[PDB]
Amino acid sequence: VLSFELLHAPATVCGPKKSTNLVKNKCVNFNFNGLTGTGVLTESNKKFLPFQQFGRDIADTTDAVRDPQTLEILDITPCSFGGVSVITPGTNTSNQVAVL
């Protein structure tokens, strides 16, 4: 029986995994060894502490992360969702629209 548990001890190496490249300033999909999310990973300006990996904010959501290999701090940001609106003079005069 292989015995393991989650959220019982902080980890930095964990179990098996492979490594790929790193990209920034693009809304990409990432998985930093158990930390899964989607966003834009710009270079961070915050000052961390040597034992202090993650980062959060008031609402307790991820806002920064440390590189497992190069040990540098880079931000996380959702990639610009929003809504659209259609402006029309009416079908009755014309048919052009303007999308906002």
Partner: protein
């Protein structure tokens, strides 16, 4: 196994009040300019902690065997590095494993396996006054280790690394928490500028290392490093001087705390939530500086 130092005279324990001490980072998560409430084991504010001390003026061979219920906040102040590594266990008769720690200059050796102790555990080094050099002489704290399971060696510990007598400038804080078969140790090494007792200041404790064993520890004791000199002739068991030593011992209880983070991500202020009606009001309001009103 080992010698049995005399003068085992009883003495009532002393007491002193802990002034906002024993706060550690509960997890490796960065937070900035936020107030976070945690539900974890902590040292309650404004409790009286014991004041074991060893002084030649009897000889005050004071290192009794002390309980380990849930955690122990250990705070030892000195300057001659008289203190040494700690020691743990449940029965201390080699039937069950017992954790050992030594913080000498070489390395932080950690022994977890079984080994039988002697009835009066003690560490002593016979310094040679003929040679202008200091070396370890005697190592007698256990009989032998028949079988062993786990071992661990880390980087050499951070000490003052200087042997002299002077003003009290060194303060050592340690938290010994073990839960779910996981042994954790925290520390801080802040200096002091006042002679005696806990200074009226606040400082947080950062994590050091995690030791996964799975052993049950219920029993606690402290090792002491003692130097024997020629200034006290006679039997080798009594021909020694211990200088001045002091260490405080507290206890940990399940209490809810409120933590204040600065913009370096360091805890600068904490508020207990079960001490005072005003403290409970602060905890409920999730802020400081409560104004008028019921």
């Amino acid at each position: 196994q080992c010698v049995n130092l005399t003068t085992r005279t009883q003495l009532p324990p002393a007491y002193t009040n802990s002034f906002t001490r024993g706060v550690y980072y509960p997890d490796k998560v960065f937070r900035s300019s936020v107030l976070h409430s945690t539900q974890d084991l902590f040292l309650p504010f404004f409790s009286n902690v014991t004041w074991f001390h060893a002084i030649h003026v009897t000889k005050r061979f004071d290192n009794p065997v002390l309980p380990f219920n849930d955690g122990v906040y250990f705070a030892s102040t000195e300057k001659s590095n008289i203190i040494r590594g700690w020691i743990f266990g449940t029965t201390l008769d080699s039937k069950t494993q017992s954790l050992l720690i030594v913080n000498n200059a070489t390395n932080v050796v950690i022994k977890v396996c079984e080994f039988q102790f002697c009835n009066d555990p003690f560490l002593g080094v016979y310094y040679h006054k003929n040679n202008k050099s200091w070396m370890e002489s005697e190592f007698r704290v256990y009989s032998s280790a028949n079988n062993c399971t786990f071992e661990y060696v880390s980087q050499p510990f951070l000490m003052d690394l200087e042997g002299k007598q002077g003003n009290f400038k060194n303060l050592r804080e340690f938290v010994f928490k073990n839960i779910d078969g996981y042994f954790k140790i925290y520390s801080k090494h802040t200096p002091i500028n006042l002679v005696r007792d806990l200074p009226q200041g606040f400082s947080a404790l950062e994590p050091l290392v995690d030791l996964p064993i799975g052993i049950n520890i219920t029993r606690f004791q402290t090792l002491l490093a003692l130097h024997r000199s020629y200034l006290t002739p006679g039997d080798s068991s009594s021909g020694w001087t211990a200088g001045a030593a002091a260490y405080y011992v507290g206890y940990l209880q399940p209490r809810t705390f409120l933590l204040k983070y600065n913009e370096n991500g360091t805890i600068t202020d904490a508020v207990d939530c079960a001490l005072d009606p005003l403290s409970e009001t602060k905890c409920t309001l999730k802020s400081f500086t409560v104004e008028k009103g019921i």
